[PDB]
């Protein structure tokens, strides 16, 4: 590893574009390749990434390759091709190209920035349903991702102190459901989110 990037995360909104700079702390000039992957089923256990061409993919990243002089920084431009209806998330990798009894193990560092492609009007809607096990399920109705911290399970409309609190710290992405794992039949729920919503719980 001879470089670094700023920045590690970014959200693109409104069709606007932002920049990620790449810094050379090596004194020997280098070459960086840039490539993007779209993250499928994010926040879940079946999350996977897949390559997208730089122009007809959700995001346009320019340039695709760069000369990195020593001690200087290039700029990589991120812009959303088409704003999307619901939030989309990508990873933009910055690998380097180095091509010109014993054992040699060359060690190499790669950075991947996590880019959120955000929708136009941001809404958060959380729907509750119950599982076969009768466990409580939370579906992300909302286009933007959820980010739940703790969930105060509740016996009745008001929380008081008899209601179970379990901390989660897990994000919920749109069109995904999350199992809290609870099968007992509480009536409501209260949720905090990273920067008090109260909703009825289905008994089905």
């Amino acid at each position: 590893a001879n470089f670094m990037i700023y920045p590690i995360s970014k959200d693109l909104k409104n069709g606007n574009s932002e920049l990620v700079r790449v810094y050379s702390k090596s004194k020997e000039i280098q070459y960086i390749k840039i490539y993007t992957k779209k993250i499928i089923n994010p926040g879940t256990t079946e999350e996977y990434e897949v390559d997208i061409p730089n122009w007809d993919g959700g995001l346009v990243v320019t340039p695709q390759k760069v000369i990195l002089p020593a001690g200087a920084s290039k700029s990589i431009r991120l812009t959303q091709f088409k704003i999307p209806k619901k939030e989309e998330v990508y990873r933009v990798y910055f690998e380097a190209v180095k091509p010109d009894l014993t054992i040699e193990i060359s060690i190499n560092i790669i950075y991947a920035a996590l880019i959120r492609s955000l929708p136009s009007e941001q809404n958060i809607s959380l729907n509750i349903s119950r599982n076969a096990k009768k466990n409580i399920i939370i579906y992300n109705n909302g286009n933007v991702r959820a980010g739940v911290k703790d969930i105060y399970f509740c016996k009745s409309s008001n929380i008081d102190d008899n209601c179970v609190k379990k901390a989660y710290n897990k994000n919920i992405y749109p069109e995904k459901s999350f199992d809290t794992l609870v099968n007992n039949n509480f009536s409501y729920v209260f949720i905090k989110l990273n920067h008090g919503l109260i909703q009825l719980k289905v008994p089905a």
Binding site: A1, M4, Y6, P7, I8, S9, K10, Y23, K25, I39, P42, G43, E47, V89, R91, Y93, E95, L101, T102, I103, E104, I105, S106, I107, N108, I109, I110, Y111, A112, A113, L114, G147, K149, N169, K170, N171, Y173, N194
Partner: protein
């Protein structure tokens, strides 16, 4: 336009600025928003308030003109103040620019021109002033001049004066600044490696080496979570890392990795991703880490072997 009476004197204050992230350009940040320093209905002794810095070259307490402005004509503008900021946990020192201006107050007139701190007084519609306000602020983009995130602090001292007359006191302002740098993450190996391979009893061999590393993630943040992946090209979906004889793809040798990172120890398989809770323009300081390689081989053919390993650094999706 209603004002209360007030007599100038020494004051002590604390001003907190932000949290402001380092990544976005710093906006303007107010230390004082036309703070009233003096006012009076009856007299006009507060008709020429000036504010002087203690030294004009010393940045410890802010450096700016330490004497009354010589000319009769006013100086319209802002005063530049070079002020020394110290990060709290490192005691590193950086000097930033501060903008300051006064503004005069008149009973029957409104004349709100901004003046330099030491500037001379004026009359509005042939009326003398009765008091003065004082504004001080961090310009836009100044907090991006700071080398790394952290709690930066400074103390500002201005003398409160009647121009060419008595000094009334000293304003001490404590300015704390909470810089964030949340998008800041680096890794460095300060120093390719060789497993120094030697034989042991039974025809077995053993090798072990390790690389020390510099590792940082943007701080004064809230608890963050990161993702790291280790992979070998010669990844066969075993979760095992491999060394193939160069020139002989047929032969493979197996090795393992372990990493102690800032007091935490893990062994990763070949393709596994690991979350790191941090609870467990960029900054040089780094929490220590060590990747260690190891291998145990019996009856191995001579000739060199090589292995390339990609270590990917990413925020993960199951975060907040």
């Amino acid at each position: 336009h209603h004002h209360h009476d007030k007599n100038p004197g020494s004051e002590n204050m604390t001003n907190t600025i932000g949290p402001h992230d380092r990544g976005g350009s710093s906006p303007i940040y107010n230390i004082l928003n036309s703070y009233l320093t003096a006012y009076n209905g009856s007299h006009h002794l507060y008709d020429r308030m000036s504010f002087l810095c203690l030294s004009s070259q010393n940045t410890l307490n802010g450096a700016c003109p330490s004497s009354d402005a010589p000319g009769t004509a006013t100086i319209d503008g802002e005063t530049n103040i070079t002020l020394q900021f110290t990060e709290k946990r490192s005691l590193i020192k950086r000097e930033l620019q501060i903008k300051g201006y006064k503004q005069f107050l008149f009973k029957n007139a409104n004349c709100p021109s901004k003046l330099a701190l030491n500037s001379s007084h004026f009359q509005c519609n042939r009326e003398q002033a009765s008091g003065a306000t004082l504004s001080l602020y961090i310009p836009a983009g100044e907090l991006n001049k700071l080398p790394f995130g952290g709690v930066w602090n400074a103390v500002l001292k201005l003398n409160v004066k009647r121009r060419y007359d008595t000094t009334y006191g000293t304003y001490t302002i404590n300015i704390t600044v909470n810089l964030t740098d949340k998008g800041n993450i680096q890794i460095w190996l300060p120093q390719r490696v060789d497993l120094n391979l030697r034989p042991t009893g039974g025809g077995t061999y053993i090798g072990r080496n390790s690389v020390d590393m510099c590792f940082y993630d943007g701080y004064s943040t809230n608890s963050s979570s990161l993702e790291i992946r280790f992979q070998d090209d010669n990844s066969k979906s075993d979760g095992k890392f491999y060394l193939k004889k160069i020139n002989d793809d047929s032969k493979e040798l197996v090795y393992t990795l372990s990493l102690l990172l800032a007091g935490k120890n893990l062994t990763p398989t070949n393709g596994q991703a690991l979350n790191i809770n941090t609870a467990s323009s960029v900054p040089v300081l780094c929490w220590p880490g060590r990747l260690q390689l190891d291998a145990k081989v019996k009856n191995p053919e001579a000739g060199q072997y090589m292995g390339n390993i990609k270590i990917t650094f990413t925020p993960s999706s199951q975060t907040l």
